[PDB]
Design a protein around this ligand. Structure first.
Ligand code: TPP
Ligand code: TPP
Ligand code: K
Ligand code: K
Ligand code: K
Ligand code: K
Ligand code: MN
Ligand code: MN
Lengths: 329, 391, 329, 391
């Protein structure tokens, strides 16, 4: 495919995307809490030694500062790759992201921009992260015109999507599913390559039902697809959304026009979750093809619990049962 | 000797709490008195006549424009305005000390910096009217100015957000060996925001060539400073972050100039932040939405005004007189009125422009919404003010 | 109805709710930027003189501080009524609202709570507020279990709903449509009364289509209802949602089961707006009754513009045209 | 004399920037040396034997519990842990100076405060295991303790959020004439957050009876203080907000005690905030998720440890000996092990409890989701660890 590859898990593919970026773009800098020694998930190991202390460095412990600082770097045209240590701690920077980064180009009539900013952050459940190490905040950002929000499902996908975020001329939030950081490795090009933003990927074709998810939850719906085939004789089309905003409306709609049924799943809570935006759009576009109501299989409308995690998450059984009801509707 | 990594300090064997000294705080640096006389000759910057006349003419032209735009808002011609009365000295004294290409971030009450940099009256006007000439495309409220050519970052309403941003620009400047400073203006109210604490700290730890310039004008809308803080103003906070700090009489253009000039030299040379707190008084209302009589001026307007103080200096030096004052008042009025008339005659921009620049490229779903408005206007256009807008 | 009433516009009804509250609840305090002199919209005029400087007072200019401070008052059991000067400036406090206030009771197992906190803030378009004086942030808060979000349409409604927020044992955000502050007065009880939270109000019965909105936009859909009747012979049921979360699912669904058609409208941008949550829920619950796709008539997916405001907002013509297409579907 | 409303100050006629003094910062207050000898008798608090033995036994019982829970996490028995090594003196010295009903807000590394207040071993255990006895219902990560009976506000992971919250509690206390102080603990890293700047300022302007207590232990995870700030630590920031401030040797229980006692008296009497920066060293890893060898201890563990320093004091006074040390080590181990065994035997709480307390009353739509899980478990229960959970 893309020159020489090597086996990488997700943390290593992130390190490789970042190394590629600082090798080819002399303006690029990487900064945040504890990034200098390699980061608490080891995503920046080696980079300070390779590229210098002025390019990979620790900031003070202040998320509103990190994002404000990165916007300012990007205003000058330099590539700024900010890290927020867990996506749960992105909220102190919410005003800098929503009122500042997202609106920077528009409000200046394109005199100024912070296009060269990317914010990367660990995201999603991790077994025992509880309320503040498990969150999936993408729906809070989906309602903010002017930012992009991108979430990969695997090492190959992560490196391609992150490089696209870094290079894209708009402020981007890149959420890394932390439960995948040391999951199975796969072949990843050593050299840079890009995967397009605002493009969903149909990873398995099918004819009876369309399943949509992102991040780790893609792997859950792939397993649900295999259960439906074996237990029900049902052919499921499985789509990784990849980009939360702007999202690939056309690919999802085309699939649902074919299948007539849609199930969307995400770890984030149901109410106000991004599944509502996908559901209400597909319903408007595909209304005449819908054989059953669009299903949403999500986290409960509660904070993310410590000891009850196994009961909280939208697992393959929850998703299977929902799919079973939808096919019988 | 203490071995703790967190501080460099001796032991002490008596319990003694450090007491803030507020009653006798950081002294206010002043070069000329209210009569425009130099107090200490060794501090006199001895600026050349043509530059001092530029300070003065910039301040008065801004005053002229303020009076006209304020009145234009009261007549319903622009939606909003904020005047700069009493603070015009902090603007031009500091701008005069900068290189043309030093990057400026501001709050909203620093228009004199753009004036000093020769920003055209036409474009101040175009932004307040949101007309076709506005490079901001009419998207923001009046007085939210920006100019890429004159290195003045577009103003935004959320307070203090520009502070950590200016620090990041300063870092990038350091890496590029730009040999330029960033200056970042804000009010004493805005200094209360969490962003100020982030900016100050990041500037010192990351060693950034930046001047933090605080206009302390005694109020944040209705809120007096006794309710804003209990420390010795904003200057007293700088040293705690490791920032070289100074307090200046901001109604004295020379004191402001001298402090900004020295800060700029050292910040760019040493890659180190400086804080200047300019003490002034907010003569006008907070904005055209505020009636300051609801909560509180002529002492300041008549005894200690930056324009009056520099005029006295100019009269004392024989560099200005009544005949020159009279002729300049007249010509600057005429120049502002000419820009004003031209600005009111222009249409507003094409309504399509509400959709571009959200992202660099318009997403397909956003183009679809743009197309939806076009179709909407084809059927219902008579219910919209289309004749005010370019077509 | 409720004892002696008097004519009040919306700012005055707010003043009256707050005066009632501090008269009957000795713990109650009111605080924020510029509240002491009466506030920039005059909602707290007279209260400092009446109740004392320790009860109605100015804070420093720091929204994260205001909300953190109010949570702390409420942790002790005292009623804390925080003001945020414009809803556009609520974002600095987003971490204190989402990670702290909303999760306070849950995460402590009910050992501690901040139930006695209410945050009130001016909200919605105002003619020329541009990007930072016009926002409608309710969808950002809708995705956060543990808070309530309430928006009134009129002076009588505002006083009843605000008193319910103040008294409710959960942290509440009360958004006041600032374009209504000095709009027409109506009769408002001088003494306290309550309007229930999580209850929509059907303000006009109809049989062909259900229209849902909140705040000022309720008045727009009421006028659209009168246009549809005159121009199309269409009977519209008009519902004020009132509470954004938790919302009155049953009332909306019952209406749509009757009419078979639903149009939802809100000034906030379409994508991730709260209309998606209402649409996707009604679609799941009422699927077999839907005669046409659920319509959403919203702000565009852009920041809120200064000079283009008349073109941006989901006005009666935009809503009428959509309704016309839906009835012809 | 300057007339500006923003500061109380004289004029000065020479340009002079205020320079931070970091090399020789705020001295570190110390009552006993590393040999447990009193340095200045007039500072000796002469606490009675039984209270000093409580300080010591609280510190060592916490150390015993840390060792056992750390090892329990390495064995996979609890999901997470954070030790308090080297900082046990800041905890008990300060808690000893408080009234039982003074309200505490914390960060996560102040468990000794709860120990000192006699929080049962069973409930430290129950929270770490998330078992049926946990009053937090197993909802939060380990070490996120809370106790309403002992006035210790439930810990939360987001840093510094408790700071402006503690200030609000302190305000409410003032209004109620509670005659109580609030104390608010945080690390030097957390002091970088915008919330710290909000809390400090609101405390001074609103005149609140609160003690801000900063543990400065030289690291915030991997980040050394040279990268956290460039001012003279956290103590040097207090005066700029108008806060009485002091720096203490936090490995000296008496220095910590004396500073907390005096701050409490004055804060409650004057309704005024105090800041204490306790200088210490983080002996352990940041948490069980951290391997500190990746970025950096025995100097501190062996030369300057709060427990060793107080033991020496106790041995010097003839108030403890080897036989007492040996017997106490044994009994506290046995008490911790007894709580531990009991905690591991208990089931986790009923899974329904994941839904309650989101709001006070469960909304109807939330009850529907609760009902949906119950129905789900009736069909698919064999795929869930139901036998670990109450039924
Ligand atoms: C985050 C935020 N909160 C509140 C406001 C509303 N506001 C606009 S200006 C102002 C006062 C600012 O005072 P100061 O910084 O002292 O500047 P000055 O107007 O006195 O020059 C306030 C509260 C805002 N723009 N942004
Ligand atoms: C807002 C936020 N950002 C980041 C974190 C991740 N984090 C958990 S503890 C920690 C270091 C805190 O250091 P310090 O305050 O110095 O306390 P210490 O652990 O040294 O006692 C960090 C960065 C968090 N919990 N909250
Ligand atoms: K980018
Ligand atoms: K700003
Ligand atoms: K409430
Ligand atoms: K906390
Ligand atoms: Mn001010
Ligand atoms: Mn630390």
């Amino acid at each position: 495919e893309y020159g020489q590859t090597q086996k990488m898990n997700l943390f290593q593919s992130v390190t490789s995307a970042l190394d590629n970026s600082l090798a080819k773009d002399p303006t690029a800098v990487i900064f945040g809490e504890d990034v200098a020694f390699g980061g608490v998930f080891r995503c920046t190991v080696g980079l300070r030694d390779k590229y210098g202390k002025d390019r990979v460095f620790n900031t003070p412990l202040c998320e509103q500062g990190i994002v404000g600082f990165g916007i300012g770097i990007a205003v000058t045209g330099a590539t700024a790759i900010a890290e927020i240590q867990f996506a749960d701690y992105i909220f102190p920077a919410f005003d800098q992201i929503v009122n500042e980064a997202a609106k920077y180009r528009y409000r200046s009539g394109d005199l100024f921009n912070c296009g060269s900013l990317t914010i990367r952050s660990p995201w999603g459940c991790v077994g025992h992260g509880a309320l503040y190490h498990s969150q999936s905040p993408e729906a809070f950002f989906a309602h903010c015109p002017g930012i992009k929000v991108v979430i990969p499902r695997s090492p190959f996908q992560a490196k391609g999507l992150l490089l696209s975020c870094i290079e894209d001329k708009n402020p981007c939030i890149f959420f890394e599913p932390k439960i995948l950081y040391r999951a199975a490795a796969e072949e990843v090009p050593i050299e840079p390559y890009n995967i397009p933003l605002s493009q969903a990927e149909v990873i398995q074709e099918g004819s009876d039902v369309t399943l949509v998810a992102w991040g780790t939850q893609v792997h859950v719906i792939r397993e649900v697809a295999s259960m439906a085939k074996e237990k029900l004789g049902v052919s499921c089309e499985v789509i990784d959304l990849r980009t939360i905003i702007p999202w690939d409306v056309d690919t999802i709609c085309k699939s649902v026009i074919k299948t007539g049924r849609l199930l969307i799943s995400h770890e984030a809570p149901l109410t106000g979750g991004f599944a509502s935006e996908i559901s209400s759009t597909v319903q408007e576009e595909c209304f005449l093809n819908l054989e059953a109501p669009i299903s949403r299989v999500c986290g409960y409308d509660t904070p993310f619990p410590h000891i009850f995690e196994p009961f909280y998450i939208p697992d393959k059984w929850k998703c299977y049962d929902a799919l079973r009801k939808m096919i019988n509707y | 000797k203490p071995q703790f990594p967190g501080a460099s300090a001796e032991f002490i064997d008596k319990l003694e709490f450090i007491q803030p000294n507020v009653i006798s705080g950081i002294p206010i640096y002043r070069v000329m008195d209210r009569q425009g006389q130099i107090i200490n000759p060794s501090e006199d910057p001895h600026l050349p006549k043509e530059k001092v006349l530029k300070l003065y003419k910039s301040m008065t032209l801004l005053n002229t424009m303020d009076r006209i735009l304020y009145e234009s808002q009261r007549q319903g011609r622009i939606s909003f305005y904020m005047t700069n009365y009493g603070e015009e000295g902090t603007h031009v004294g500091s701008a005069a000390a900068l290189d043309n290409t030093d990057l400026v971030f501001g709050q909203y009450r620093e228009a004199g910096v753009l004036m000093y940099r020769d920003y055209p009256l036409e474009l101040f006007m175009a932004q307040c009217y949101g007309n076709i000439s506005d490079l901001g495309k009419g998207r923001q409220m009046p007085v939210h100015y920006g100019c890429k050519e004159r290195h003045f970052v577009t103003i935004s309403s959320p307070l203090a957000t520009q502070i950590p941003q200016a620090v990041g620009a300063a870092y990038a400047a350091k890496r590029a060996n730009a040999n330029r400073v960033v200056i970042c203006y804000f009010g004493e109210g805005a200094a209360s925001e969490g962003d100020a604490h982030a900016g100050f700290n990041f500037a010192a730890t990351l060693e950034c060539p930046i001047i933090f310039f605080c206009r302390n004008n005694g109020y944040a809308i209705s809120t007096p400073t006794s309710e804003q803080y209990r420390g010795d103003g904003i200057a007293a906070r700088g040293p705690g972050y490791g920032i070289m700090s100074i307090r200046v009489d901001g109604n004295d253009v020379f004191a402001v100039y001298n402090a900004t000039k020295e800060a700029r030299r050292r910040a760019v040379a040493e890659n180190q932040p400086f804080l200047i707190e300019a003490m002034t008084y907010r003569i006008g209302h907070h904005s055209t939405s505020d009636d300051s009589s609801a909560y509180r001026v002529n002492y300041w307007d008549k005894q200690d005004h930056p324009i009056s103080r520099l005029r006295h200096y100019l009269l004392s030096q024989g560099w200005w007189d009544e005949e020159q004052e009279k002729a300049w008042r007249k010509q600057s009025r005429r120049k502002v009125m000419e820009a004003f008339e031209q600005a009111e005659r222009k249409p507003k921009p094409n309504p399509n422009l509400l959709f571009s620049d959200v992202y660099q490229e318009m997403p397909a779903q956003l183009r679809k919404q743009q197309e939806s408005l076009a179709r909407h206007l084809q059927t219902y256009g008579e219910h919209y003010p289309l004749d005010h807008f370019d077509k």
